[model samples]
Target: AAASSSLVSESVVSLAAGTQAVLRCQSPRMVWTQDRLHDRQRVVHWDLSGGPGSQRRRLVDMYSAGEQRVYEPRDRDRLLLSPSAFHDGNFSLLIRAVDRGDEGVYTCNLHHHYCHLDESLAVRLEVTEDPLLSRAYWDGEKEVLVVAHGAPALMTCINRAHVWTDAQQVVHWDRQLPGVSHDRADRLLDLYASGERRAYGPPFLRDRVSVNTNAFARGDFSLRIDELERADEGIYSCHLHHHYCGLHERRVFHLQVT
Candidate 1:
C-alpha cells in the first residue's frame, strides 16, 4: 500500500491579480430543501487571515434563515456569497477584482444548531501580480532621453485623456534591459491610488528612482532617475492603471547614459 497521506481539507488557489475568483465549499451531507425551513439554523462563517498584518478577521457570515452579512467593510461590494449556494449546498465565496491585498488563508466553518453537524474548509488564496496579464499597449510613440552619467533623467508620461477627477489611478515603472526578455522586466516602483509610493527590487532603485507626486494629480506620471549610470541604460515602461475607470495605458522610453 502506498504511504502517501490523503488530501486534507485545505486547498490552495492561485489567481492573477485584477481577476475575479470563487472559493467553492461543498458539503455532501447538507440538504437545502429540508434544512431551509427547520428550526435548526445552519451557519456559515468565513474568516480570513494572513493578509498584510496577518490579523484574523471575519469575512462573511450566512444563515439558512435568509440572512447574510459580509464583514469586509472596505470591500463589501466585491465580497459576496453566491445566491445559488444557499439552495445547492455549495458555500462558495465570490470575489471581484482580486488584488494583492487579498492574498490570505480563508477558513469557512459550517455549523448546525439542532444536528451534530460541524464541518470546516480552508482555502489559501494566492494572488500573483503579472503585468503581462494586463499588458498595456504603447502607441508606438517612442522617446529617447539622454542624460549625463551623474545627472538626473526625466522620463515623461502624461495621459491626455480627461479622466474623471476622482478616479483612482495607480502607476508602475518597469525596466527591461536591451537583451532581457520582455517577460523578465524588472519592476522599479509603484505609485498607488492612495498616493502611497513603494519602491521595489534592488537597493539602488529604492534610493534614486521616484515619480512626481504633485504632477501625478495632473496626469503626469513621469519617472526621475537620479545620478544615472550606464547600468541604467535600458527601456523604461510607465504602466498606468485606473482601477475605477478600467483604463490601462503604457508609455515607453529608451534611456541612454553618456
Candidate 2:
C-alpha cells in the first residue's frame, strides 16, 4: 500500500563574501499518477523568498520549461539542490552577489489543483560574521598504572576556576559505548556540570575539572580531566548560556580521551 504523508526539509548554502551562489530546491515524487498513463498531479506554481510583497534586493532567473522549471543566468551562477524522492523534485532558484541584504527567511511552495493542496518548506538564511571552532582531543601522553586487582577507578576534576565566569553555563563529560545507541534515552556514564544540577544524576569530579575565573581574559574557558579510564573515551561538550543584544551563542567542545 502507498503511504500518504507530507514532508519538507530545508537548508541554506553559504557563499563567500562578494560572491554569487545558487539556491536549489528539490522535491521527490513531485509528479504522480493513479492510472500511470495520465498526470494525476504536478507542481504548478512555485516561489522563493519569504512571502509575497516582500523586499526584493537581488535579481532572480526562472526558466519555465515543459513539466519542469529552470532558472538561467542564475544570480552569480550557483546551484542548490536536495536529494530525495519527495524532497528532490528539482525545483530551483538563483541569487547573485550574496550580501547581508540576502539574509532572511526563504520558503518554497508547491501548488497542485487536482488535490487542492499546497505545500511549502521554510528556512532561515544567516550569514555569519566569524568562523566557529570545534575539536576533540586527549589530555596527555602519560599512562597511569592501577594498583589493586579490584581497585575502583578514580576520576579527578581539576578546578580551573578562572576559565568560566557565567554560572548559567553547563559542562558535561560523557563516555562513548561501542555500537550503543546514542539517542536521547542512551545511558550517560557521567554528567559533571549541567544546566540544571541534579543530585541523583552524576557525581561531581574531585580534582580533575577546573573553572578558573582568571583565564577569562585569555578566552580560556576550558576543562581538564585526569585519571582517565578506558570507558571514558568519548566526547565532552562545554556549553555556555548568555543572552544579550538579542542574540545567543551556544558553544560546545567534543572531547575524546584515548
Candidate 3:
C-alpha cells in the first residue's frame, strides 16, 4: 500500500483537543503495530516512536493478559492499542482525549518483541485547541468547527504579543476541500494592517463574510461570516502574517453549518 493507506498514512491528522484521535498506521505491505512474543515471554511487540528516525519511546507495552508500561509523557493514560481488533493488514493507534502537546511526528515499529527497530510507518498529528479554551495563538489545528446556520462564524486569529502593525502584516481567509494544504485554498479575501481592509469572500458567501477590524492592536484577526448558508460548509484556512515574529502562521477549520 501507499505510505498513506486509506486507513492511515504519512500525512498529518489534525483534531481539536479533548477529543479522541485515531492515528491509523496501516500500510498494505508494512506493519505499524505488532503482536506475538519473544523467547523471554515479553508480550509487547510494537515500539511506538515519538518521531520517525528519532528517539524511540515505548508508549505502551503490556503482557498478552497483563499490565502495560507507558513510557511517553503525552501517552501516559490516553494511548490505546488493540492488535486483535485490527482487521487484516491494518495497524493503528488510538489516543482518547488528545492533547495539544500531542502534535508531532509519530511512528510505530513491528519489533519481534526483541528487535531493537525494524519495520515502521510514520505520520504527523496536529491537535488544535478551541480559541475559547486557549487564546493567544496564530497557529491552529485542523478540526471541524460548527457555526449555527444564519449566524456568524467567527474564525479567530490572535497575535496577542504584538502592539504594532504594517502593510506586510496581512490576514487572509480561504476555503479548501478535505485534507491539510500548502496551496492557498480558494481566496475568500484578505485584510491589511495599515488600515481597516474591506471584506472579500467567495461567490457562495454572497457578500456575507466580514473582517473585524477592532481587535488587531491586542491581536485578534477573527473572520466573521454573517448568515451562513448550507452551501457554505467546507474547509476554511485562516492565515496570519507575523511581522513581529517574522513568520507566517495558519490554521484550518472544517466548517459545518447547522
Clashes of each: 0, 35, 0
TM-score, per-candidate, Cα-based = 0.35, 0.27, 0.33
Model 2 scores worst on lDDT over the 10 consecutive residues at 157-166
TM-score of 2: 0.27
Task: List the lowest-lDDT window of 10 residues for candidate 1.
Answer: 157-166
Whole-model Cα lDDT of every candidate shown, in order: 0.54, 0.32, 0.44
Q: Write the per-residue lDDT of candidate 3 for residues 3-54, one digit (tens) a residue.
A: 2211111234344433332222111112112223322132333343355577
- Per TM-score, the best of the predicted structures is 1
Two-way lDDT contest, 1 vs 3, winner: 1
Off by over 4 Å in 2: 1-38, 44-46, 50-72, 82-101, 133-258
Clash count (model 2, backbone only): 35
Q: Show where candidate 1 strays beyond 4 Å.
A: 1-38, 50-55, 131-258
Worst 10 residues of 3 by lDDT: 157-166
- Alpha-carbon error at 171 in model 2, in Å? 64
RMSD of 1: 29.4
Model 3, TM vs. native: 0.33
